[PDB]
Amino acid sequence: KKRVFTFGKGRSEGNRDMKSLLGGKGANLAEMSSIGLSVPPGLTISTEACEEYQQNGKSLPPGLWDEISEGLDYVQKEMSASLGDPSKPLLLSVRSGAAISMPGMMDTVLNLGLNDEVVAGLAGKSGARFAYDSYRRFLDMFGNVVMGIPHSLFDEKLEQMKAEKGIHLDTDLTAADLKDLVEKYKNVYVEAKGEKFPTDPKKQLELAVNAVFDSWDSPRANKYRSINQITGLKGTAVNIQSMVFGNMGNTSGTGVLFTRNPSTGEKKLYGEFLINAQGEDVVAGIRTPEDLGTMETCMPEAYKELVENCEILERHYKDMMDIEFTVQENRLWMLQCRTGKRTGKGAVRIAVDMVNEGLIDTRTAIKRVETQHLDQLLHPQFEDPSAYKSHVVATGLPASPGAAVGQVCFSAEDAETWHAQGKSAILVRTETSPEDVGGMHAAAGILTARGGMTSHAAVVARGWGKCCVSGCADIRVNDDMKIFTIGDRVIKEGDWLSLNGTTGEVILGKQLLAPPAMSNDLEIFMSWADQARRLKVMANADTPNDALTARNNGAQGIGLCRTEHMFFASDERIKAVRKMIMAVTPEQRKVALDLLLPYQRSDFEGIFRAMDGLPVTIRLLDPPLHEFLKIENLSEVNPMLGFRGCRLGISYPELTEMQVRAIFQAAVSMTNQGVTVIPEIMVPLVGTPQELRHQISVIRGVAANVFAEMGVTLEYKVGTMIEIPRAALIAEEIGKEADFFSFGTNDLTQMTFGYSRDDVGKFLQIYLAQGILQHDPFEVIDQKGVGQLIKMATEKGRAANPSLKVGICGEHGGEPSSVAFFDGVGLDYVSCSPFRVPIARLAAAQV
Amino acid sequence: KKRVFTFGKGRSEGNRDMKSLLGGKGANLAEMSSIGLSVPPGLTISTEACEEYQQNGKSLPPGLWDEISEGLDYVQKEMSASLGDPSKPLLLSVRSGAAISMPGMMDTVLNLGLNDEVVAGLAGKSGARFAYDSYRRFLDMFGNVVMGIPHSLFDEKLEQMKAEKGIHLDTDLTAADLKDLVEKYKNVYVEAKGEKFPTDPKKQLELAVNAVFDSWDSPRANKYRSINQITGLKGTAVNIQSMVFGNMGNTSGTGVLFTRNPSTGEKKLYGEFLINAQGEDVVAGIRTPEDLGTMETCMPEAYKELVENCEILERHYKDMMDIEFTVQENRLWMLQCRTGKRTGKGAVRIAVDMVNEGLIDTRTAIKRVETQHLDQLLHPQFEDPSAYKSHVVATGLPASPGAAVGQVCFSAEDAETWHAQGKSAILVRTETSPEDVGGMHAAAGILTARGGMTSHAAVVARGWGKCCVSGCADIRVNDDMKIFTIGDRVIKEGDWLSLNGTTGEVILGKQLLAPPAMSNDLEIFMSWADQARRLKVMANADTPNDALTARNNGAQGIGLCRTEHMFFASDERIKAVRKMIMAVTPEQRKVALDLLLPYQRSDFEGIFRAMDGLPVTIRLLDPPLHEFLIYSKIENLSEVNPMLGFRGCRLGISYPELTEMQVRAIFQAAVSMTNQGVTVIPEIMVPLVGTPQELRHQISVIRGVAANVFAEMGVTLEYKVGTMIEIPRAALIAEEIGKEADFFSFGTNDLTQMTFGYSRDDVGKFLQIYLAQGILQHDPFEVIDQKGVGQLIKMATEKGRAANPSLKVGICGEHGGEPSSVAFFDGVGLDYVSCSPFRVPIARLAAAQV
Ligand SMILES: Nc1ncnc2c1ncn2[C@@H]1O[C@H](COP(=O)(O)OP(=O)(O)O)[C@@H](O)[C@H]1O
Ligand SMILES: Nc1ncnc2c1ncn2[C@@H]1O[C@H](COP(=O)(O)OP(=O)(O)O)[C@@H](O)[C@H]1O
Ligand SMILES: [Mg+2]
Ligand SMILES: [Mg+2]
Ligand SMILES: [Mg+2]
Ligand SMILES: [Mg+2]
């Protein structure tokens, strides 16, 4: 079929939608040529020509070169110049471009088509210093990019001429000086490769095309595609384009810009421009580029034409654009455009402002603020700073701003483990290596005693937004004792610690965290997301601070309240749980449970007070007993699948009798003060329907006994958590007896894959390397496997009970691809951590 | 609808198939009456009358009593005697019976229908001492069984008259003496309950029927149905039957027999008979009953008629029969029959012999030897006794015969734990309580230093067939030190020990065990099972002794060879495994693996040598590293859930040099053993496959090391590589796995664990409680769960076969021996079941019985 697509004045054979055959670069070059912008004419060789090149043994196919000669005749016709003609020279650039921007592709060669004769005619036409400088550039770049010669061999001949002649800067080289450096660069070819330089532009061009195709199979490119699971791309496109020269004088240059400020969203051009240079010299950092307001004054015609063109591109693409442009003697040329990268604050503002401008609607605005944009705006702060100002023990460097509260761990292994166990971990070490990065991503905060603002932990944490305090030197860490000292004060492993990476303060114990999310444009945006979403969002709240904090983020109820987290209360809660954990005769056991209802009823009262009017779904006692650390009988080989959940609750029914009485008694109590209370009881680890029915009998019994204490007016629901794969297999029998389902996708992933999350680190990252797992199954839900159990359990459940409310309270409630999947299956709510609530609120809206 | 079914001379309204409405007793009474045997006439009240009684508030339904009177008119017409008529008295028995033999039902009342007038007429007709003796029996039984008076209150009036009169035995009481004891028994009623005895036989009968119906709701019956998951039976039947009298004199009696010997299978009548007694007096053990050879001589007409009737019953039912019969004045009467219980040895012999007689065919013979019969014949023995005769350290009592080889444990907790972990455990304790029974069922052998042949461990172990040595007194056990001493010699926990419960010998260390299965009738029987079965049976063999031992039991190959079990050999294997277990840098790791191929290739050579000609399926290294028992090394190996940790193919994709090692070992031993003409069909199984990419990774390593190994010589060996289906996700995405796999094998241990969410070693805190309250109908680790795990087995087999038609699908879990599971795997359409070597014949029988 057709594999060469031209583009020129007002016409182009392709468009912005054909990125698979033309890459974003060639596609957008065609689109800008169609729109009518001044785009240098050229042609694009298809990615299917690259696929055919890579499969026929690195050769051009028969028709390809003649088809290239056809497109070159089009470029030569429009430019009125032939390749290799010293009278009317046509100089080219060879550019790489795939459908996705990626490393390993061949760098662009500029000023192609030069030799001694052409430079003579070019110097005659357009100035000598320009011509020999461009020929210097060509020899350097062509040898570098096509012939594999290092750039250093050319730079050393440059510095050698600067020394031998006594010149200082590049600008102080004469035309004859550059004419000699041309000869030196030509000699580099013979000195390095043993072959002289191609004088024939047709062979120059062919070697450049072959090199761009060869770059598709480059090791850096193969490593990028292998490490990012990047499939489906079958090649790169080659863009041969006529040269415009930003180095003919001081009325020429090269520049880049965003059409709006990518950090702040401000509707002002944000770019750089360098006078008398080519290509990527504005980004290379040797010469200092100037801002656009400088070009407004010294190149006014090109700046007016630039503002015009940027207004046209925002109108056409309907988005903020990242642009490359080049001016040749006051005449502007457009050479690349694409949708510009921006921050979260910029994405929100540009989105909202573009709605107010009538450029896009709200559905596209929701689809243009990524969840990673929104994550940059949900970093927590401390509730009241003056509360901790007396608990500050140390003060280091404010490496990455934020606020973290967690437990002290001294290894990245324990950080991955404690994050998998549900703890909040603060990784304290003298310094961080890349071998720690995995655990560094698991920790809520990082604390190092070494390194500065450009430390490893500092830079790494800035990329993530994690809180980090660096170079806190008064800390002395001791990994062998699992302790660090601040002066005379010792801090052991597992102790609570807080970090203010904005001020660099190290703070004792737990502190109150709050969301800051105050932006007016953000409030409007999340208003759009709440209107557009079908799926509801609940929260995973245990403490009453987390309930109000969750409700403030827009939560429509609590989908999971863990009762075991109620035992982080005080001396009187933590010490009393040991009584039930070391119970012997059920007479001895009933003395610990019946001495605990005020210990939980007031705790539950805190939850109902914050969440009045919205459903609160409380689970029963899930985890096993031997993690509140006689003790030999409690030790288990696999505590993930041991005496746990409803299994300790059918055995030992007095625990269920206790906590179910606490929830109902707090429900009646809080209901009398006008607080509307809709409670739900969730039974964990249901694998058989008789397990559920046993807990329903205990729930109905204790409920009717509790409704002796006053009026019985409270209507309630009882349901299961779907954690066990068998529950999904026999859900038709479970759904008849259940009021709601809630998928526990942590335990369901664990038992479906056969993975213990705490023990997965010895192989998991290795599986991610070799493409065995496309994603982390604990972060992203597995649609082909676990998803079938979610699908069948939902279908069987609904078919056995039409009024069945089905949700999910796993860690997957925040991940956007998972939330997209749960809307696919047709769930009613997702439940996630309180600070993750807005992420789900956006993810539920983007489908 | 119809609720009373009569039975009498040559006719009966029911048949042996109507056990739901008539119970086995009433059904077989009807069947014997139809065949033409002398069965006393009576009637059967349906179980539906019992169901309706239990739901209407303990009352008779409307027409039932008139319906009972219709059947009694039939019984009265045949016997020529009316109920309550002193001229022609009809005496009855009231018998219980449900569809399944079960406790809690009411014991039978005999001699019903007596009072002062009736006994006067009965004494006038048939003898006085007979009549008052029968009236004595009636008051005693009727008060005991219907009125809830203890039997002791009647027996003490008997012994009180024997004391006050000076008589010794029952025979020395005259008619007038029994006539007085009758008055004493009547007074027992008033002394115990405050009410006198029912004189009206119609009220006597109604109270007896009400009592049988009430017995269905008795606590012992409710406990039996609750503990054995017996649903759907909705009542018991009532059999009212005319009395025949085995106590009229010395030409009458009661007897019982099996038609053949239930222990040995001998085709000779095996029974007892007691003269001048009623009902269960032959079994009660107060008087000494006589054998049938006595009855042959002193009651010849009844014994000819008895042999005739037993020949007729074996002909009709086509089985060995358990019978009750009663003689009244040289005339034989049949009162109960049913298929007799017998042992394994008897079941096999009677089955085979009945085939040779052309009474039953082979299909029914296979369905008449239960797997629990066959388990009584597969108890292992030692390979050569003389080998250990010099290692005997102690000698105790031969409590229960057998042979056990295992590790020494000192608690029932460690016995349950070590049996769940896969170890063979020998429970050594001073004596055994019932609190140990659970662990006693887990141990391969029991050793006690106290108690005799009737000890707790002795009797318990005889019921199971487990090896037990009792009362070995020269042993001194110390549970706190985890040790026991024999004289000066100390034996620590975990040490290997062997026991011969047949001779009572205590033996040092491991010994070679062997099957004894030598019976010619058994060999013929298992020949029939092998012909009838579709499903193949493989073995789970690791040691070369287990491979030949398995091949001897009829195994058609090895379905699972655990490579980790190759390391439990000697100093040079157990010490070398610690090198690979403590490997750090892959230069350090490759020094332990490459120094181990002869360590495993000779081990594998032992397997190929025994299993020439049949497929051997070897799995890769399954279990995690941290169970081969350093501060930086042992902490990295400690895991929270070692069942789902760095395990199986996960350490084998990570650290690919382990797979590169053992895959080279299997192939090099394959070529080596193939050159000596031994036909070798090897198979490589990759465990814990959850993603198809895990499998394909191991296939690339398997194909690579295979082609490298075929540089050593010829590549003539064609092989198969496949997965074990342990992970539920593998069943969910089996369509992608079957394309890259040559065979599947379901690991139903791990699959049950991950499907239910159960850790087997941690299930004891709740499992038996779940078995109580009917939450789990069966143990999911012994019996396969069809509604749940079975769906994953079903879909993985269907998807696998649909993606690869030549896919051989089997199973090598513990469920390969359970008959209900094997029945299920034939249902799904598997190709083989693989199980332990001594369990091989059980599967061979279970695969045949469908
Ligand atoms: N034909 C041309 N005339 C002038 N400048 C060009 C031409 N082709 C490319 N350039 C410029 O030279 C540099 C190299 O281009 P390119 O490698 O396409 O950018 P990218 O960094 O996306 O790969 C850029 O500054 C680009 O604008
Ligand atoms: N009508 C009868 N005449 C004589 N003997 C009877 C009569 N009914 C039952 N028997 C005998 O009395 C005893 C009662 O047996 P039964 O307990 O009814 O059967 P089982 O306990 O086996 O279910 C047995 O010895 C039986 O043979
Ligand atoms: Mg560019
Ligand atoms: Mg859970
Ligand atoms: Mg009987
Ligand atoms: Mg396994």
Side-chain angles (χ1 to χ4, degrees), chain A residues 638 641 647 724 726 759, chain B residues 641 727 755 757 762 785:
Chain A
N638 297 306
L641 300 176
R647 307 202 271 264
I724 285 170
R726 188 170 184 275
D759 298 324
Chain B
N641 292 309
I727 285 169
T755 305
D762 300 324
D785 175 62

Side-chain angles (χ1 to χ4, degrees), chain A residues 185-186 188-189 191-192 194 197-198:
Chain A
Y185 282 8
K186 288 184 286 191
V188 173
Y189 285 128
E191 295 174 356
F197 138 83

Side-chain angles (χ1 to χ4, degrees), chain A residues 25 40 93 95-96 108 110 241-244 254 279-280 324 326 335-336 338:
Chain A
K25 190 181 292 182
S93 68
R95 311 173 70 177
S96 66
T108 290
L110 294 181
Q241 191 169 11
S242 153
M243 280 299 296
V244 294
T254 312
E280 287 168 13
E324 299 176 17
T326 299
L335 288 102
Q336 194 169 350
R338 64 186 174 187

Side-chain angles (χ1 to χ4, degrees), chain B residues 475 477-480 483-487 489 491 493-511 513-517 521-522 524-526 528-529:
Chain B
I475 293 172
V477 185
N478 189 357
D479 59 347
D480 291 323
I483 197 172
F484 67 76
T485 64
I486 302 170
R489 306 185 64 183
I491 290 91
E493 186 178 358
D495 296 338
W496 288 94
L497 189 68
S498 296
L499 295 174
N500 190 181
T502 307
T503 62
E505 292 176 346
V506 178
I507 304 157
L508 287 170
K510 291 171 73 174
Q511 295 295 322
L513 298 175
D521 298 333
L522 184 64
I524 295 168
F525 180 79
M526 299 305 290
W528 298 338

Side-chain angles (χ1 to χ4, degrees), chain B residues 619 622 647 726 750:
Chain B
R619 75 188 305 175
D622 190 5
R647 185 181 181 179
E726 289 176 335
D750 290 334

